[PDB]
Design a protein around this ligand. Structure first.
Ligand SMILES: Nc1ncnc2c1ncn2[C@@H]1O[C@H](COP(=O)(O)OP(=O)(O)OP(=O)(O)O)[C@@H](O)[C@H]1O
Ligand SMILES: Nc1ncnc2c1ncn2[C@@H]1O[C@H](COP(=O)(O)OP(=O)(O)OP(=O)(O)O)[C@@H](O)[C@H]1O
Ligand SMILES: [Mn+2]
Ligand SMILES: [Mn+2]
Lengths: 144, 143
């Protein structure tokens, strides 16, 4: 085991920002890489086709400024960063991209933009742990 | 975030053994500590002399397995605090992670049951949902 390549999927939520702290903690003196991923949920997005395309382009643009600030923070600590924005089902794309990129670990929050108090584990994290064969570091949301 | 103190709860399963490689990968140049914990599940003990006999055999078997893990961890330079308790595994792991002030819990996705159809063991599901500590879930073999 060596944690050379990390997958860090973010939905720009407060809990995902806690998980960024842990991505930064994995830095050593060796060379390391972060796959920085945001998924635009296609289910939410749902001529007709023309309208869909234009809408998908708008969500993308609106996620680029957030991704650039994170990419710069991570580059400043010494990582190489591959940033990806993709339209699709979030838990499926995280699992697919962790396998395609050959990562050593996925570091993610326990909760995300919904963060309902009664829910004790978000559905993207629960599906990624159950469906991926990669190690998953689950960083918990703030206390109360 | 600094991973100075790790809680490594083991049931001595094959998936827990995979998780032990990840505990060793957390070693750096700095002083690190592992809380090595084994819970004897009280629900599998619950005639009274039969219980004590079973209890003793489980404690004896746990101490023998824990001694070898402890040395393997000390050999890579950890300080190890080894703990054996009788109780409910997920509850004891949540409680001892808090009481020891660990930085992270490193554990398997599955354990001694390891049923193919089950995609996350109930100990790990409970610890993720009840603990506020970061949890590194190490998955079972793909075989
Ligand atoms: N669209 C996404 N793109 C990338 N990562 C995401 C996305 N959505 C969630 N995540 C990741 O999953 C973690 C857990 O958030 P999750 O979405 O499961 O929780 P939630 O929003 O509280 O619950 P739910 O979506 O089930 O209502 C996040 O901290 C983030 O790391
Ligand atoms: N009694 C225990 N003591 C310490 N750690 C344990 C104990 N039982 C399980 N664990 C931890 O939990 C991880 C996940 O095992 P878990 O018990 O949840 O899976 P399982 O045995 O396949 O399923 P289940 O117990 O629900 O039948 C193990 O790899 C280990 O790290
Ligand atoms: Mn969500
Ligand atoms: Mn078990």
């Amino acid at each position: 085991v060596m944690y050379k390549k990390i997958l860090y999927p973010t939905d720009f939520s407060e809990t995902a920002e806690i998980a960024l702290k842990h991505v930064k903690a994995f830095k050593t003196l060796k060379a390391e890489e972060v796959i920085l991923l945001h998924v635009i949920d296609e289910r939410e997005i749902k001529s007709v086709e023309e309208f869909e395309n234009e809408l998908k382009n708008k969500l993308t643009e609106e996620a680029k400024n957030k991704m650039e600030n994170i990419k710069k923070e991570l580059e400043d600590v010494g990582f190489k960063v591959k940033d990806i924005i993709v339209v699709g089902i979030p838990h499926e794309e995280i699992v697919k991209i962790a396998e395609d990129e050959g990562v050593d670990i996925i570091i993610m929050g326990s909760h995300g933009k919904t963060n309902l108090k009664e829910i004790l584990l978000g559905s993207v994290t629960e599906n990624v742990i159950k469906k991926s064969n990669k190690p998953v570091l689950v960083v918990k949301r703030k206390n109360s």
